[PDB]
Symmetry: C6
C-alpha cells in the first residue's frame, strides 16, 4: 500500500529498518512470518508467482496449488482494496507476490537471516557470480549450509545438463514457491536458463522482494561468462538491482566479496570470505565495512 | 481541449502561467483542485491510469476503483465531446489522465507546490537521479518532508528487494492514483523497474501532466548506472522530457542541483542544495538562477 | 486519383502550382476549401484520421464524429470508386485523409497560407526544430500569431509534463482533426511523444498532405535532442520528408532559418528570421532565396 | 508455370527475349497484352495485388474490384492448376500478380516500351534515385512524357506533404493496379513511404514483374538520403534487384545514368542523359553501352 | 527413421555411400526413385512442401495437389509411426519432405546425377553464386543443359522483374514440387527473393535433402552482392550448409569452381570450369581434386 | 523436486556423485534406468519432449506416443504433486523431461556411460565441434562405435542436404525420444539446423539433463563456422552450458580435446584423442587431467 510520513515517523521507520538488520535476532523475522502464515484460514491464497507465459499460479500456506477460489476482497489501511480470485488453476484477480500481509508498516527492510563467522547476512536474494576459477556451485552449497546453521537448507535445481535436473520453468517456480513457504535458507543452482520469457522477467524482478518479505534467503548462482553485451548487461543489472546481496569472486582463487544492502536508503556493507576444498569438492568457508556507490559499480566491471 | 489566441489573450496566458509559479501562494493550486474534485457527483470517474497491459483502470474522487459505469458523454467548450464508459473493471471508453477539468483555460503551468529554504518548488514530476555516491533514497525522503512542510508526505514503494515492497506494476499504478487523488507531496521510491510494457510507457508520459494538473508533486528516484545506451538514453529522455523538475547529484558528495521548468515557454531555473546525514541515514537539506538549453544538456551528460 | 498529362497539360499544372504559392492571395485556398466543406450534405463524412491502434475515426464538416454511416460509394473521374462506411465509431470502409475532394485536378501545391514581414508562408506541415538555446515553444506561438494575422490561431497541446496537457494520443488526433476542420493557423506543442504506434506513424505521414489540401498550416515543435540515432534519424526524416516547411534554429541565438517547399517539383526557398523576447517570454519575430538539395541536407546535419 | 528446355529450345528462348527488347516495335508488347485483357470474359479476375495487411484485392479488365467470385480452376500446360476465388472483397484463393496469361512461353523478357532520343527503354520498373542536386520529381515527369510519346502518361501520387496527395497505402495499390491495367507509361511520385508492412514488401517484390509482363513502364522516384544503413541498404537492394531499369544522378548537375536490364541472362546497357529546366521547373531531356556487374555495383555505392 | 550400426554395418554403409557417387551409373538413382513413386497407390500423398505461412501443401505421384486425405498411419522399421492427414488443402498431420521412403537403409548419399566433360555431378541442391562479372543466369542454364544430357531440363522462374515471371512464393513451391516429382535436372532462376518468411526458411533447409533423396539436381542461382552482413552471411550459410554442391565464380571471367559433397562424412571434391559465350548470351561450358575444410571457407570469403 | 541437506548429508551426496562417474561400472546407470522404465505400468507416460511450437508430445516405455491420457496426479516426497494429462496428442498437464523418477535422491550426476582407450566417458549431452580441417561427422560415428562397445549405437540424422535426411523438427524430436528410450549410445548428425523456435530452444536446454538422467550419451555434431556473433555466441553457450561434455578439434589435424563435467560441483576433466582414417572415410580413434574454469573459456575462444 502507500505510506504517509512526516519527519518524526520517517525517522522512526529508518531506525526500525536499521534494527531489522543490525540488532534483531538472526532469523527472528522468518519465525514471525512463519507464524503469520500458519495462522491463516485454511485454503486461503498466500502466494502468487508467475509461470512462463506471464500468468500467475497460486499457493496456500502448505505449498499446495489453489485451482479455484471465488472472488474475495479485502480493504487495506490506506483505503485501497485487495482482491484475489482463482479459476482453472490461474489467478483471475490479484497480484504477484505475497497475498497476505507479512510486514505491515515495516517495509523496506533486509531482515537479518543469519550470522556466521562474525558477519550478519541479509534475507532476500543473494546472487553468486563472477569470472575466474573460483567455483560458484560449491560456493552456494557452502553458504547454504553455513547460513542454515542448525537448520538444513533447501536446494532448487534447474537447467543443468546433469542427472535429475528439472529444465521446465513452470516446475521451477513451483519448487521456488514451496521453498520460500517452507524454509529460511534456499539455494538455487543456476539462474542461467532464466537469463527471455515473461515468467522469467517476472521472477527476476519479484524474487528478492518475496524472500525479503518472508525473511528467507535465496542464494542463486549466475555465470556472466558470455561475451554478449545483451545478456552480460542483464547479468550486471540483475546483480545490481534485483539482488539484496551480492557475492562475487575476486582475483584470488578461493576468495569472495560479499556486498549487502542493509535496508531502504541504508549503506551497503562489504566483507571478504576465504574458502578451501576438502574431499569430493565440498567447500568450507573460513571463519576467524561500508562501501560507496562508485566502489559498487567498480565490482560490477569485473563481469566484462 | 484546444484553445484559441491572439496577441492579447496570449499575453494574458503567459502572465497567468508566470504567476502560477512565481507569485501564487505555495500549494494554493492543490487546494483549488481538491475543491474541484470534491464537487464531483459521487461515483463519477475522475482519473484513469494505464495498467501493465495498456488497458486503463478508473477511480472516483475517493480513490475507489469504478468497475461499471454506463456510457456518459460531455460536450466541452471547443465543441469537443468526452465520453466515459467502464465495463468489467476496465475503461471501455475514455482517455488516460484526469477525466474532469481541473485546469480550465489555465493550462501550461508548473503550479508552485511549496517553498522551502528560500526556493519555490514546482508541482508535477521531479526526478531525482545522477551518478556518484550521493544517495537518492535519503534525498527523496528529505525532499518529501521538506515540501510537505506542515503536511505528511505520501510514500509509494516499488521494485526493491526489501521487506514489504510491492513489485506488481498494477498495484503500483493503484497506489499512485490514490496518492495523487489524496496528497500534495508524493515520493515514489524506485521508478527503476518501470524503466518496457505499455503501462510503463503510459506512466512515464502521463504522470508529469497528471501531477502538474492536480498541483501535487511526485518525487521519483531513478538510477542511471547501467552502461547500456538503450536504457541510459531512456533515463536522459525521461529526465529531459517527462519531468517537470530534475534533481541531480553533482561532483561533490551531499550536493545536488535543482532544475525547474517554471511553465510553458518559460525559462528553467536552477539552484543548489547542500545536505548532511544525521542518525540512521536520515538526511537533512540545509537552508540558509536562469539556465539556458545548452547548460541543461550539459547536466544531462553527467549520466553516461 | 490518378491524372494523365501530355507536355501541354503538364506545363499548365506546373504554372498553376507555381501560382498557388507565389501569386495567389494569401489564405485564399483555405477560404475556398472552407466553402467546399460547407456545401457538403449534412452527415457527410469529410475527414478520417488514424487513432493509436491504426483504426480511423471519422468527422463531418462541423468536426463532430460520425459513429454510424452505412456504405456509400462515389465514382470519380478516373473511373475509380470511393466507398465510405462507419460502424460502431470506426471506419469500416474508406481511407485516411480528406473524404471529399478539396483539390480536383489542382494537386501538388503548397498553397500560400499567409504573408508576414515580406515573406509568403506555405500551408501544410511546418516543423520547428533544432538544437541550441533558441526556444521552440516561444517560436511556434509567435509564428502562430504572426500567420494568424487578423485571425486567432488554434493551439493543440500534447505530451508535456505541464498542467492541463492531454497525453492520450486518441484525444490528440481528435484535437488535430477539429483544428484543421476549423482554422487556418494551427500550433501543435510537442510532437515529441509521437516520435512508435501505428497511429503515430499514420499521423506523421498524413498530416502534411491533409493540411496542404485544406490550405491550413500546422506549426509543430519537435526536439531532436536525444543522442539515439534510432530516433534522431526519425526526426531528420520527418523534417526532410513529412514537412512542407522547416523552421530550424541556427548558431546565433534568436535566429531561425525557414526552408519552404513551394510546390511539387518546384524549388525550395529559404529566408532568415530574427526574434526577441518581451515580458513573460512572449517572443516577437522582427519584420523589416532558392536553396539546393545539398544545402538542405547540410541544414539536416545540424540535428546530430 | 515451369518450363523444360534442351539446348535448341533454350537457344530459341534467348533469341526471342533478345528480340523482345532490341528489335520488336516499341510498345507492341503492351498493345498485344491490351488485346488479351480486352478479350477476357466479363467479370473475370485479371489482376490481384497486395494491400497493407498482406491480403490481396482483385480487379477485372476494367480496373473494377471484384468482391465475390466463386472458386474456379484452370489447368495449365505443365499440368499445374490455377485457382481463383474471391470472398468479401478479398482473394480467398489465387496468387498475387496477373491472373491470366499475357506472356505464354515467352517469359524473362524486358519488352521495349518506347524509343526516345535514339535509345530504347524497357518496360517493367524503373527506379529514379541518387544523391546530389539533380531533382527526381522533375525527372520522372520528363521521362514519363518522353516515353509516353504520342500517348499521355499516368501519374500516381503518394506520400508527399503536398495538396491532394493520397497517403493511404490501400488507395495507392488501387491507383497502381488501375494504372497498369490502362496505360503504357506510369509515373509514381514517391516510393519513399513504402520504404515495413507486408503489402509494401509485396509491392516492391511484385511490381517489376507485373509491369514487364504487361509491357508497361512504371517510373518510380526513390530518395536514398537517409543515413540509416537499415533503410539505405533496402534502397540499394530495391534498385539492384527489383528494378528492371535504374536511372541515377551523377556528379554533374542535370546529368543522369540509365542502366537497363535487357532480359533474362542478357547484358545490362547504359547511356547518359543531359537535361535542362525551362519555366516553372519543367524539365526537358536533351536528344541528340554494355556495362559489367562490377561497374553496376560501383554505381550502387553512389547512394551511401 | 533411426538406424543402428556396429563397426561392420557402418563400414558397409560408407562403402555403399561411396559407390552411390563414384561408381553407380549416372542418374541411376533418379530412375530407381521414379520406380518407387510410380508403385504408389493412386491418390497417396508422396510429397509435402511448406508454403509461405509455414503450412504445408501435399502432392501425389502425378504432381497433383491433394486437398483431402483422411488420417492414415504407417509403422516404420524402427517402430516409429508416420501419420498423414490432409484437410481443406493443407496438411493436418504429417511432416515436410518425402512422405514415402525413397531411400530405405541407403541414407546419407549424394547420388551421381550425371557425368559431363569427365566429371561426376551430384544430385541434390547446387548453388551458383559468387561476385564478379561472370553471369549466373547463363551459367545455370548451360549447367542444366549439360547435366540433362539426353533429357530436357526443367526451369522454374521466380522473382525477376521480367516478362512472365511469377513472384508469388506459393506458386513457386508448387512449381518446385512438380519439377522434383517429374524431372532429374532442375534450374531455379533466382533464389534471391527467398533470401524471411517461414516457408522461405523451410525451403532452404529442405530442398537439398528432398532432391538428394529423389536423385534429381536443383541448380539455383544466388547473388551475394548486397553489402549487408545480415543477408550476406545468410548466403554463405546457405552455400555452406544447405547446398550439396556449390558453383562459384572466380577472379577470371568465364571461370568457375565446383565444390561437391560426395556423401555423408566423405571428402568434398573440386574442379574448375572454363566457359564462353555464343550468340544471344548462350553459354557453353568447355569439356576437355579433394579439398579440405579450410580451403572451403577460403572460397566462402569471396562473397564479402 | 527440492532436497534438503546438512553438512553430513551434503558430503554423502558429493561422494555418491563422485562415484557415479569415477568408480561405478561403466553403463550400469543405463541398465538401472532401463529396469525402472520396464517396471512401469503399461500405458504410463514416461517422457515428454517439446515440438517446434513449444507444445510437448508424450511417450510410454516402448517409445510409442500417447494421444489420450486422463488427468492423473502423484504426490512426491517433498509433498509436491506431479500431474500428467494428454489430450488430442499433446500434453495438457505435465512438464517436459522424464515423467517418472529415474534418479530419486541421487541427482547432479554425469553417470559413467562407457570406458574406452583408458578413459571414462560421461553420459549426457556431448557436443562435437570446432573449426579447422578435422571432420566432425567421421568423429561422431567413431565415438558412437567406440562407446557402444558391445552394443550398436543409434543414429539420428537431421538437417543435411544428403539423401534420406529428415529436415522436419517434429520428426527429429520423435527420433530423439525413441533413441533415448531405447539405447545407451546415440549419435545426432547436425544440430546445426536447430541453432530459433520454441522447441529448438527447449531441446537445447533439456537434452543434456534427459540423457544424464537416463545414463545414455547423445553425441551431437555442431559447426561454429558462421561469422555471425549472434549464432556463434549461441554455439559457445550450448557448448559451455548445455553440454555434459565437449569434444573439440585442435590445431593439429586429427587431434581432439575431450572436456568432461564429472558431476555437480565437481571438477572438469580433459584428455586428448588421436585419430586416423581408413577406407571410405571410416575414422578410428587410437587407444594406447583436471582443467580449470579459465582453461575452459580459453578452449571456447577457438570458435571465433
Ligand atoms: N577440489 C577442487 N579444487 C579446485 N576446484 C574445484 C574442486 N572441486 C571443484 N572445483 C571447481 O568447482 C567449480 C564449479 O563447478 P561447476 O559445476 O562448473 C559450477 P560453476 O563453474 O561455479 O558455475 P557454472 O556451471 O555456471 O560455470 C569448477 O570450476 C571446478 O573446477
Ligand atoms: N550515514 C551515511 N553517510 C553517507 N552515506 C549514507 C549514509 N547513510 C546512507 N547513506 C547512503 O544512502 C545511499 C542510498 O541508499 P540506497 O538504498 O542504495 C538508494 P540509492 O543508492 O540512492 O539509489 P539506488 O538504490 O537506485 O542505487 C547509499 O549509497 C548510502 O551510501
Ligand atoms: N525571456 C527569455 N529569454 C531567453 N530565453 C527565454 C526567455 N523566456 C523563455 N525562454 C526560452 O524558452 C525556451 C523554450 O521553452 P521550453 O518549455 O523548454 C520548449 P523548447 O525548449 O523550445 O523545446 P523542448 O521543451 O522540447 O526542449 C527555453 O529554452 C527558455 O530558455
Ligand atoms: N528551375 C530549377 N533549377 C534548378 N533546380 C530546380 C528547378 N526547379 C526545380 N528544381 C529542383 O527540383 C528538385 C526536385 O523537387 P522535390 O520536390 O524536392 C523532388 P526530389 O528532390 O527530386 O526528391 P525528394 O522529394 O525525395 O527529395 C529540387 O531539388 C529543386 O531544387
Ligand atoms: N555475350 C556476353 N558476353 C559477356 N557477358 C554476357 C554476355 N551475355 C550475357 N552476359 C552476362 O550475363 C550476365 C547474367 O545476366 P543477369 O540476368 O544479370 C543474371 P546474373 O547477373 O548472373 O545474376 P543476377 O541477376 O542475380 O545479378 C550479365 O552479367 C551479362 O554481363
Ligand atoms: N579420407 C579422409 N582423409 C581426410 N579427411 C577426410 C577423409 N574422409 C573424410 N574426411 C573429412 O570428413 C570431414 C567431415 O565431413 P562433412 O560432411 O563435411 C561433416 P563436418 O565437416 O565434420 O561438419 P559440417 O558438415 O557441419 O561442416 C570433411 O571435412 C572431410 O575432409
Ligand atoms: Mn555451476
Ligand atoms: Mn534507492
Ligand atoms: Mn517546448
Ligand atoms: Mn520528389
Ligand atoms: Mn540472374
Ligand atoms: Mn558433418
Amino acid at each position: 500500500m502507500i505510506h504517509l510520513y512526516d519527519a518524526k515517523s520517517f525517522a522512526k521507520l529508518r531506525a526500525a529498518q536499521y534494527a531489522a538488520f543490525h540488532t534483531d535476532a538472526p532469523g527472528s523475522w522468518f519465525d514471525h512470518t512463519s507464524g503469520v502464515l500458519e495462522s491463516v484460514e485454511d485454503g486461503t491464497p498466500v502466494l502468487a508467482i508467475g509461470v512462463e507465459s506471464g500468468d500467475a499460479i497460486v499457493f496456500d500456506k502448505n505449498a499446495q496449488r489453489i485451482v479455484a477460489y471465488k472472488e474475495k476482497s479485502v480493504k487495506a489501511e490506506d483505503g485501497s482494496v485487495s482482491v484475489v480470485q482463482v479459476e482453472n488453476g490461474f489467478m483471475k484477480q490479484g497480484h504477484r507476490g505475497w497475498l497476505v500481509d507479512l510486514t505491515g508498516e515495516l517495509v523496506g527492510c533486509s531482515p537479518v537471516v543469519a550470522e556466521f563467522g562474525g558477519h550478519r547476512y541479509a534475507s532476500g536474494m543473494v546472487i553468486v557470480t563472477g569470472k575466474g576459477n573460483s567455483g560458484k556451485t560449491p560456493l552456494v552449497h557452502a553458504l547454504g549450509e553455513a547460513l542454515g546453521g542448525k537448520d538444513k537448507y533447501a536446494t532448487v535445481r534447474f537447467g543443468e545438463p546433469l542427472s535429475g535436473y528439472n529444465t521446465d520453468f513452470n516446475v521451477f517456480v513451483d519448487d521456488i514457491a514451496r521453498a520460500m513457504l517452507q524454509h529460511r535458507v534456499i539455494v538455487i543452482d543456476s539462474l542461467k536458463n532464466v537469463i527471455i520469457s515473461r515468467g522469467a522477467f517476472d521472477l527476476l524482478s519479484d524474487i528478492g522482494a518475496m524472500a525479503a518479505s518472508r525473511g528467507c534467503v535465496v542464494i542463486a548462482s549466475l555465470n556472466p561468462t558470455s561475451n554478449d553485451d545483451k545478456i552480460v548487461e542483464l547479468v550486471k543489472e540483475a546483480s545490481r538491482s534485483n539482488s539484496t546481496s551480492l557475492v562475487i569472486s575476486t582475483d584470488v582463487d578461493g576468495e569472495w566479496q560479499v556486498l549487502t544492502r542493509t535496508g531502504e536508503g541504508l549503506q551497503r556493507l562489504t566483507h571478504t570470505l576465504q574458502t578451501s576444498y576438502g574431499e569430493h569438492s565440498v567447500l568450507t568457508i573460513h571463519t576467524s565495512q561500508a562501501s560507496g556507490k562508485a566502489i559498487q559499480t567498480v565490482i560490477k566491471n569485473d563481469e566484462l
